Amino acid sequence: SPPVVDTVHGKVLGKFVSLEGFAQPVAIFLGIPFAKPPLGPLRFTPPQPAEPWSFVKNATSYPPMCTQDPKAGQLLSELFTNRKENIPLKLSEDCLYLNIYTPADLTKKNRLPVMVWIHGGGLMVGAASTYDGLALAAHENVVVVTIQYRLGIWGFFSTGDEHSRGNWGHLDQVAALRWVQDNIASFGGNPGSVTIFGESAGGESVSVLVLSPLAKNLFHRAISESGVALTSVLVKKGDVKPLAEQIAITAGCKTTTSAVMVHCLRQKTEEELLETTLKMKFLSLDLQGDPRESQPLLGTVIDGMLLLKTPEELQAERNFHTVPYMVGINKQEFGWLIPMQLMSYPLSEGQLDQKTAMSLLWKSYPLVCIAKELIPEATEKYLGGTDDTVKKKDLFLDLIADVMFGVPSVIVARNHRDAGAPTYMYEFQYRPSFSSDMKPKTVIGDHGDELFSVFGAPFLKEGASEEEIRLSKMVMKFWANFARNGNPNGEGLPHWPEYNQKEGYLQIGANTQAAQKLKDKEVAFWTNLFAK
Amino acid sequence: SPPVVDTVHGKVLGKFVSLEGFAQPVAIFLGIPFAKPPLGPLRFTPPQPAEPWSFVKNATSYPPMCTQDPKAGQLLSELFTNRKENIPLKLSEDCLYLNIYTPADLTKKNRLPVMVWIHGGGLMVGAASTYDGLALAAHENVVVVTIQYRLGIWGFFSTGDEHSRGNWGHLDQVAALRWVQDNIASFGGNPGSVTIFGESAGGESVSVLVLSPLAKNLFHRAISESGVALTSVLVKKGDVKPLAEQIAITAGCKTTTSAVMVHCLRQKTEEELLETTLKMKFLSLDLQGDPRESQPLLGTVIDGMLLLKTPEELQAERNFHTVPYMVGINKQEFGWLIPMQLMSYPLSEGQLDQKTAMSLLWKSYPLVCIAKELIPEATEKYLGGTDDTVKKKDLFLDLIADVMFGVPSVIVARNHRDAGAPTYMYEFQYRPSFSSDMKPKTVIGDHGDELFSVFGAPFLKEGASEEEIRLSKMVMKFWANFARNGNPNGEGLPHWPEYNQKEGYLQIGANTQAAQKLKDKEVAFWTNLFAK
Amino acid sequence: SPPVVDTVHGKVLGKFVSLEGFAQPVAIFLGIPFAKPPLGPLRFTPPQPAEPWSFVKNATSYPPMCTQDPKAGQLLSELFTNRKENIPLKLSEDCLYLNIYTPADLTKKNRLPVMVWIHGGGLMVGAASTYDGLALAAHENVVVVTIQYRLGIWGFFSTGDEHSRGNWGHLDQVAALRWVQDNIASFGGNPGSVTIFGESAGGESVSVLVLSPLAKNLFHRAISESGVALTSVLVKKGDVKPLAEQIAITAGCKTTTSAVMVHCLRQKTEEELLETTLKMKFLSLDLQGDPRESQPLLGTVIDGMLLLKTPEELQAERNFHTVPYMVGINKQEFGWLIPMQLMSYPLSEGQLDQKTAMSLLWKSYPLVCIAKELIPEATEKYLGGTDDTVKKKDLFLDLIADVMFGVPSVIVARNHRDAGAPTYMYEFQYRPSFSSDMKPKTVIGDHGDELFSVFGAPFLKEGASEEEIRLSKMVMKFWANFARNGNPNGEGLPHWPEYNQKEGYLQIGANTQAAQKLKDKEVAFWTNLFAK
Numbered sequence A, B, C: 001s002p003p004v005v006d007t008v009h010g011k012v013l014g015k016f017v018s019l020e021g022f023a024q025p026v027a028i029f030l031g032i033p034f035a036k037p038p039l040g041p042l043r044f045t046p047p048q049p050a051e052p053w054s055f056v057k058n059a060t061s062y063p064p065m066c067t068q069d070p071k072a073g074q075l076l077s078e079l080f081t082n083r084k085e086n087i088p089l090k091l092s093e094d095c096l097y098l099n100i101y102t103p104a105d106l107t108k109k110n111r112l113p114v115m116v117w118i119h120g121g122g123l124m125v126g127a128a129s130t131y132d133g134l135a136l137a138a139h140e141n142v143v144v145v146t147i148q149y150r151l152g153i154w155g156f157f158s159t160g161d162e163h164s165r166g167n168w169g170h171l172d173q174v175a176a177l178r179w180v181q182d183n184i185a186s187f188g189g190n191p192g193s194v195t196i197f198g199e200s201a202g203g204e205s206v207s208v209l210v211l212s213p214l215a216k217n218l219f220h221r222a223i224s225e226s227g228v229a230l231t232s233v234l235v236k237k238g239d240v241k242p243l244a245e246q247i248a249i250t251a252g253c254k255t256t257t258s259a260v261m262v263h264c265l266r267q268k269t270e271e272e273l274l275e276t277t278l279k280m281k282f283l284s285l286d287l288q289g290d291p292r293e294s295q296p297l298l299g300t301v302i303d304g305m306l307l308l309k310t311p312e313e314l315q316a317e318r319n320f321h322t323v324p325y326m327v328g329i330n331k332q333e334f335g336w337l338i339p340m341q342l343m344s345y346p347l348s349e350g351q352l353d354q355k356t357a358m359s360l361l362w363k364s365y366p367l368v369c370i371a372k373e374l375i376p377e378a379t380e381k382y383l384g385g386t387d388d389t390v391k392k393k394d395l396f397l398d399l400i401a402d403v404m405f406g407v408p409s410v411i412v413a414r415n416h417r418d419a420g421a422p423t424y425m426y427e428f429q430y431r432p433s434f435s436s437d438m439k440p441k442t443v444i445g446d447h448g449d450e451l452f453s454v455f456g457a458p459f460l461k462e463g464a465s466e467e468e469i470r471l472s473k474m475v476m477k478f479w480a481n482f483a484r485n486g487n488p489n490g491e492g493l494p495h496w497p498e499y500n501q502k503e504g505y506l507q508i509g510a511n512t513q514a515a516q517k518l519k520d521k522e523v524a525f526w527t528n529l530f531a532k
């Protein structure tokens, strides 16, 4: 007796899964289309409503993930999946689907809080199917929705004008949120209480939706995990046309006009555009050439529809959605994963000098926009204290991590607090046992380590210790409490203080205690240095 | 002074033709477009209204026939044409046209009955231009409309969901009927009196329109000639996606998703799709491999728009148009044409044993859906009586013919009668002299033999005998009387009884007399056997 | 402080240029899109409104010219440009742009007359950017708009029916005029006073707009310079389909149906269509083959939307816009440019006999539609007076020029006068010093010589004499007076009489005086001869 739900566009057929320790099973719906496939002429256009179907659609198979680099996507899913076994996925330009995990009795009337997950991957890779919402939904009684969006060229190609504005992935996210508003009541969810949360590029997308006016009334709480829009690498500011012309030339198109480029790209096949994507070599640090010329990836643009101004100007004007907002970072954002596995840094030597540190900080211009004159001052600020190079390598990693994640997050939290909205901050400092054997094991709080506690990995995977299980339960309860109340606090949990003029935050880990003034001196130093 | 008619979309220039024995000439209009050409993006989509034209359109040339196998289409047109010479035709995806033959005085006010002809061909081949409506229109004072519709992949490709529902040819038929409703008053016809008649796949299409709700008020009488929707070979029930994926793989397309297949097939040229059609080898019995795997052709599906349920379920609920309905079969539906010429059967030996009969009945699974356990009982029922193999071959042909045409037609007539609508039945048993020299001359009432009497071949072709002329006159008068009155009976004609609890029918031939209980014992035996 | 103007679709950033002797600079806006790019499926379709843009558009770069033969386009721009240096241009199917030159103080309220320029080129070549409106706008305080339109196959391909009607360039011109009506008030112009003027194919375009009902209320004055719709070479009358099938076969497309041809051509790339254009060899006299078969170019057709009837029938019924109209010709329209540089005539010998004259007049059938029987009488009329073959070549050039330009212009002026609208005529007889060194210097009033006076070449280019400067000032003042008043006359100018039963006209040149009965005997002779 599988569950059957009746959405506006038709009826879907689900699947009951049972989690240990819970009598009620969770209804799971894999691959619900929230938008019309963006194929052919619809490429590089805003998403359109899905066409209604006539008979019950089977929703028990994982959808394809958006076309991307298969190796990088597979590696990212393996690294970030909370299920015991990694599920293979198929690439497709038809990828605008979402997965629903609802623990509600679909027979009765239920209004549960809805948490919508946005996956990371630098806006280039990633899949919604990587994350299983069975444990979180079962434990916390929330409806978990994991959405997909266009990536890479398909999602963020822009000519800088009205012919290809860009920001197609964020428009897909807005369309998915509208779908949730329209249909989540049939799955037991409460559309009047929707929380968006994401990690890395997902956190940047969450921040963008907080800034965007297109997303008004589509959510009520927000969580940013290791990502904000102030992160310079993802938000593309300046002249966007040189990158479009480079992409078009690589694809083999004429660059006479924006319309000509867009038309010629719309005629390309999926394989040709994926070959162009591989040729461009995104998400790879360029060891040779001028650092400022290299482009790490395609990303958000100030197109005039999704974002009217830059995030800095909008935050200055207080022109954003004033919802309860949670912003947090991991203790070592740049410890192992991003440098070694994701972008193949040359720091495998284990020793870093002052000269090599300055050279590598200049080579890292795309990630961190530091002018060459400011490089020596930063490198002396961080690496100057210690003489041994072993510690200096860790200090260089800390220097990169602060600029990329820590200062922007604290600045965004301060601006959100000043606008009068409730703000909460945390710093996750813990090393999951599910980590790769490649990690040196000196890394605690690597990028994405809080994902295994947010989605209840200890209950889906094997070999967790008791403290890890308790940490997962505590983090899931904090997230669900924030989703339903806009305030993470609850009974049986350590007190999480609100981020205010005291700047209190929570240090999440083996020992969970409150602290104050997160990244205060780092923020001060980098703010002074950049204004130089 | 050729006739000029002003349709809603513009004005058309016709042509006067004079038939012997009739003073008034017949106005003929060849190639009137009733819909927009289904080219490029419009492929695999419902038909759209035709764009209006500004100056008088010349309508004196036969239109192209829908793209199909040229050899098979030419052979079928030569076999079934009632004109003295066969007219060559050109393939095109732009084929949604119709031909009109009106004997009315276009100067005066005329409201003549309108007969709309749907051509056969297994939904894979055929053309409207094969049939000349000059003789019937001249003799009976009716407006004859011969329509074309999409065939093969173009007309009936389906993925089983909303991305490509299927039944494009049937929607073309509905569009042509709506065009008739809108425009047939300008040609002297009466839109309030419209009769649809067809043969083979045309009869199956007529039955489908009787069942479809999209066709409400578009016709008032119906004739089925050697074809109904209960004919299993044409209606595709089950899972439609494996056939779609086979077609896509043959065409060279990816099968990742329904939308992917549909988009990739829309990029193929006409030549590539016709090459795929020839590769698939439709309308050919597979002598090797599992019979149940082989697909004879693309056909009607239960897509939710044209047909909401299966014909059996719809007939059980009495959910169909209760118009006067004429259903008939030929005496030998499987005598020569279909097995020898159309499908190239191996039955040319002239001798058939019991073992070979059972083997061939199993090989014929696509045409007749007989489970292998039921094969021996079916073969002993027919072939068991006689010992000589010469008669056993004819009995095997009768076995195939009954299952394909006879039992389904009688069942449809019984259901229609029970629903309370007037039903009439006939069995045509005559051998036209215009038959091919290849026929053994022992076949009387071969498939499509009644066509030479329905469309007045004796008056267009050369060498007819007096009895053939009289039979053609009688059949044309019966058809016209049914069209204008819903009851074929008239003065000077043998009494044709209504199909009711007595089950009276007409035996049309050299001797025309009424009989009772057509195919009663065959229907009983095949109904009992299938429910086993 | 560049000028910024807010059009309906957005804001545009201009550029200030200063002309000697004028304190106020002229605001120049290069490349404003008035329509959506006609790319892909929009090829062979009426123009659609432009999509609005979000931020100020940069409008300081010349747009691309419509795809065409690059060599011929470059040569024509060099020959006809009034600027000191010829500006290179880039081909593109995205070419529906216009350039604005406004001398108004954009800060204040200004309502200046608007003069809209249509460029020539036989509807096959040409660009708007060739002509600089700085001098005219500065000298006369008028807003000058130079528009572009689709050319060649892209602009005038027609199948003769509703699938591809044709006249896409004329519809582009109508769209640009509507853009002017909507937006010219923001640039200081007066939409209630708009004048359209053109040359060669631009004059034929002006005449077509005068005759068309689609252009009602889009202009209030008109000027035709060496071109009218009565010119047979540009207006294609008869059966249009053979030319379409020739084009399709050259491009490699099927010719089964009009829809098939249009669809197959829409799939061709720009390069393939340009290769087809070069293969067809338009604008070249065919020295071999039947003259009547050769097609010089694609042009206007009676499609039923833009032109309901032929120009002769429309003029007979007086069914045209009765606005003040100026029609003029140059003294030697066929002297040097068109025969030698544009179409490569064989008249470089310098001697022309009677037999060779008759042969070349027969070969010239596409330009002049003279039946072979009328050739001897036409050739004896002109060439018969003089015995020396030196003068006979000039008389042959006069014969061609009269038929092509002079008789049609006087006939059109007479028809316009009879309908009751004000009419004015001129004959420009002067030799610019900016002419090519290739001219024999015996040519005075060559084709396009008045352009250097209309657009103020003496002030932009170098080396003009005093009389040339005075002539340019006089012509510019006459044109502006006609634009603002509908009557060229003013103070300090020679009296220009109105074309009436006296048939007065103005002989523009070094000596500017009024005359009467322009081309009376030529018109009489050619009218009698053709009606034979």
Ligand SMILES: *[C@@H]1O[C@H](CO)[C@@H](O[C@@H]2O[C@H](CO)[C@@H](O[C@@H]3O[C@H](CO)[C@@H](O)[C@H](O)[C@@H]3O)[C@H](O)[C@H]2NC(C)=O)[C@H](O)[C@H]1NC(C)=O
Residues within 6 Å of the ligand: C013, C058, C059, C060, C061
């Ligand atoms: C609108 O577009 C025009 C181009 O059509 C822009 O003018 C051009 O801008 C470029 C870059 O700003 C100029 O090149 C620059 O030259 C200076 C001096 O040599 C050099 O230092 C820079 O590194 C750069 O190479 C170019 O000269 C200028 N003019 C032309 C004719 O190209 C204009 O700035 C644009 N307006 C906007 C975007 O508001």
